Amino acid sequence: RPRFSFSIAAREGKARTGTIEMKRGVIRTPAFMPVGTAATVKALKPETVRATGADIILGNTYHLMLRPGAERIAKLGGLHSFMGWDRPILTDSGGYQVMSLTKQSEEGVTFKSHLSRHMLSPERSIEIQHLLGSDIVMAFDECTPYPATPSRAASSMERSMRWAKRSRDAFDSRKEQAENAALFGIQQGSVFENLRQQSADALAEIGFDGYAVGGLAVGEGQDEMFRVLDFSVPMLPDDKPHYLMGVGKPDDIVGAVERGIDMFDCVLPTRSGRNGQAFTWDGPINIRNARFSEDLKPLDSECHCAVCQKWSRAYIHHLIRAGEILGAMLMTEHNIAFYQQLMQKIRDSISEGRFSQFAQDFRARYF
Amino acid sequence: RPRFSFSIAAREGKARTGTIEMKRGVIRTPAFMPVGTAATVKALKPETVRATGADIILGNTYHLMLRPGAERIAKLGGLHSFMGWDRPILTDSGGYQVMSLTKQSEEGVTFKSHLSRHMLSPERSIEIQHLLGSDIVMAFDECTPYPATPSRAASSMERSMRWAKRSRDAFDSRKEQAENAALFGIQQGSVFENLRQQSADALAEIGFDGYAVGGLAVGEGQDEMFRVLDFSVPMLPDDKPHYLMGVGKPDDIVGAVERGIDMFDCVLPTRSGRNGQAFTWDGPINIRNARFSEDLKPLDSECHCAVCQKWSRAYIHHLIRAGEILGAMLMTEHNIAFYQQLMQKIRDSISEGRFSQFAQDFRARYF
Numbered sequence A, B: 001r002p003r004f005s006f007s008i009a010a011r012e013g014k015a016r017t018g019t020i021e022m023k024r025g026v027i028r029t030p031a032f033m034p035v036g037t038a039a040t041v042k043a044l045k046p047e048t049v050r051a052t053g054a055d056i057i058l059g060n061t062y063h064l065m066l067r068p069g070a071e072r073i074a075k076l077g078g079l080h081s082f083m084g085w086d087r088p089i090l091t092d093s094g095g096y097q098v099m100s101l102t103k104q105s106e107e108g109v110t111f112k113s114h115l116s117r118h119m120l121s122p123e124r125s126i127e128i129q130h131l132l133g134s135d136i137v138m139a140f141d142e143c144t145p146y147p148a149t150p151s152r153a154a155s156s157m158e159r160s161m162r163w164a165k166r167s168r169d170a171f172d173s174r175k176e177q178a179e180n181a182a183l184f185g186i187q188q189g190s191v192f193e194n195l196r197q198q199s200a201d202a203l204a205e206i207g208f209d210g211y212a213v214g215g216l217a218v219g220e221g222q223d224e225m226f227r228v229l230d231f232s233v234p235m236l237p238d239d240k241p242h243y244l245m246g247v248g249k250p251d252d253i254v255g256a257v258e259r260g261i262d263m264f265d266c267v268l269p270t271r272s273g274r275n276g277q278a279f280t281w282d283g284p285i286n287i288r289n290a291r292f293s294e295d296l297k298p299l300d301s302e303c304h305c306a307v308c309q310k311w312s313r314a315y316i317h318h319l320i321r322a323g324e325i326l327g328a329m330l331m332t333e334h335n336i337a338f339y340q341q342l343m344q345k346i347r348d349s350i351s352e353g354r355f356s357q358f359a360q361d362f363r364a365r366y367f
C-alpha cells in the first residue's frame, strides 16, 4: 500500500472515476465522506458507516482540539483507535470552524472556547492533524465571508496561499507525517476568476497531493456555485483529486461531478436525517409529516439499505415525532446509505460512459 | 409450538430455572425483559437487543395507546411488525403508568393526555393488548401508593382481584387472543402478609398462566422488598412463572431469584445507561467521572459484549459528556448485555446446583 496514489480509470466530459490508494485503504472516487465532527458520525457505529459503503470519513481539527483534545487523543493511540474506524480519515484544518462557529493575525487565530483561549496557526493545525493521526491533512486556510468584496477576497486568498506554503513546510518537516499521510491544498478566491487562477497557480507551484475548492457552500446559490466551478476546477492539476468542501445536496454533487469534482463531504445526510428529512430518488421527504403516520412503505422504494428492508415510514415517523434515538439512528443510516448509492451510480455510469444520461435521468425524477 | 408451556428443568432452594415455550419463541428463565415503552428499546435496534441475549421484551398499554395509538398499530399489522421484533412481547396493562405518569372508579380510569381524555377499563386494557398483538397479556390492576395504610392496601387489592376476574373473562371471550396469547394475574396487598395471601388465593381460584408480584419497586428498600417476597412468592402456584414487576438492580434480581422469581423488567439498564451509569461485576461506575477520561480499559473487564470488545471507557466518557447519540447506544448495549450475562450465570448456576454460591460470590465482588 502506497502513501498516496490517485488513479483515474475512466472519464466522460470533465467527470472522472477512479481510486485513491492509501496505507489504511482504498477510496473510490467520486467519493462522499460522512462527517464525524466529534469523533463520531452521529448516531452510527463505525461498522454501520462502513456497511453503507463509505471508504473514508471526515474529522475536524477545531472540534477535536477542544474536545477531547489533540494531545489526549494522541495519548490514547490516535483518532482511528479512539473511535474505532480503521480506514482513511480526512481532517479539515479548522480554518472554517473557528470563523463559523476570535482574534486574527498573520500568525494564525486565537479564540474563546465556545464550550478557554486557544491559538491555531498553520504549524499548530498541521501538528494537531498529526496528533490525531489523520490520513489526509488539509492545509490551514482563512475562509472568506460570503459575499466578499474583491479586495477582501484577494487579501484572504493571498494570506491563504502564504499559509498554504507554511502548511506544506510544516508537513514535510515532520518525517512520520510526510511518509504516511497526504497533504491537500485549498483554493480560495471567492467567485472571482482571476483570484481563483492566482490561487490555483500558487497551490500548483507549491505542490500538493490533492486540491480542494474552498470558499463555496457558504451561502451562494447552486447557479453561482456551478458558475464558479465551471472555471475554477479546470485550473487545478488534472492528475490529482479535486475536493469540493461542504457540498452534499444530491443535485449539487451530481452537478459538481459533471464539473470535475472527485470528493465531497456534507452534514446534510446526518443533520437532516435527525431533523426528519429523508432522501429518496423522488426527492427529499420529511418523515414528520402526518401523511406518513400510516404509510407502510419503506423510506425509498429502491434503496437497499438495512432500514428500508426492515422498517416502514409509519414506524420511523412515530420514532421521530416521539424524539426517540432509534429514529435518529434509522434516518441517518438510510440517508448515508442513499448518498453512497448515489456515489456508486455516479461511478458506474462514468465507467460505462453514460454519466451525462444518468445525470439527466436523476434530475428528471428527483425534481 | 404451544400457546404456553412453562417447564422447570432444575431447582435449588426456592430458585428455579427452565423455559416458557410460546408461539413466537422460547423464554429462558430466570429472564430479564428489556423495556420498550415507546415501541423501541431506547437507542437499540431490535437485532441488537436480541444479540445481547434477550428472549422477550416489555411493552406498555398506557404509552402505546396514547402514541402511536392501539388501533393504529393494529391497522399497521401489530406491534411485532411495527417495531421489527418477532419474538415474545409482554405488555403491562397500564394499571401503573397512569397513576404514576385522572378520575378513578370501579369501572376503570379516565385521564388527561400527559402529552386529550382517555378511558382505561379491564376490558379496554385487554382489548388494547389484543390490538397490539401482545404474547403475554397482563391483567388490568390498581396499584397501591407506597406507603399504604392497611385499609387502602385492602381496598386496592380487592378491586384488583375483581378486575382480575374481568380481565380473565375479557381475555377468554376473545377467541384469537385466548388461543394464541397468555394471561398473567397480578398479586397485590402491599407489605401485608394477610392481604398478599387473600390476593394469591383469589388469583389461583380464577386461574392464570403466570403470576406477577405487583406493588413492589415503588419506593421500598431492598430489605422490605425481600421481606415481602419471602412470604409472598410461596403463596403463588409453584408450577407457573412468578414475575416481579419493575425489579432490575443486579443485586435485587439475584436476591429475588433466591426467593422464587422467574421474570424481571426494569428501565435501569437503559435509563441509567443514557445517564452515564455502566454496570460491571465490580459494581456500577459513572462513565462521566473525570477519572475515566484517559482510561483505555473496556467498561467491564470480563464482559463479552460488542461494546467492551471494541471501545474504551475514555471514548464512551467523551461521547457521554459530549451528549453524543452513540454514547447512549454504546452504554445501553453494554448494560443490557450485562443484565443478560447475569441472567445466564444465574440460570447456569441453578442448573448446576451452585446458585447459592454464585449469589455469595456475586455480592462479595459487586459490593
Ligand SMILES: Nc1nc2cc3[nH]cnc3cc2c(=O)[nH]1
Pocket (backbone or CB within 6 Å): A092, A093, A094, A095, A096, A138, A141, A143, A144, A186, A213, A214, A215, A216, A217, A218, A245, A246, A247
Ligand atoms: N478549511 C476549509 N474548510 C471549509 C469547510 C467548508 N464547508 C462548507 N464550505 C466550506 C469551505 C471551507 C474552506 O474554504 N476551507
Ligand SMILES: Nc1nc2cc3[nH]cnc3cc2c(=O)[nH]1
Pocket (backbone or CB within 6 Å): B092, B093, B094, B095, B096, B138, B141, B143, B144, B186, B213, B214, B215, B216, B217, B218, B245, B246, B247
Ligand atoms: N400493572 C402493574 N404494573 C407495575 C409496574 C411496576 N414497575 C415497578 N413496580 C411496578 C408495579 C406494578 C403493578 O403493581 N402493576
Ligand SMILES: [Zn+2]
Pocket (backbone or CB within 6 Å): A299, A300, A303, A304, A305, A306, A307, A308, A309, A334, A335, A337, A338
Ligand atoms: Zn434506505
Ligand SMILES: [Zn+2]
Pocket (backbone or CB within 6 Å): B299, B300, B303, B304, B305, B306, B307, B308, B309, B334, B335, B337, B338
Ligand atoms: Zn460490555
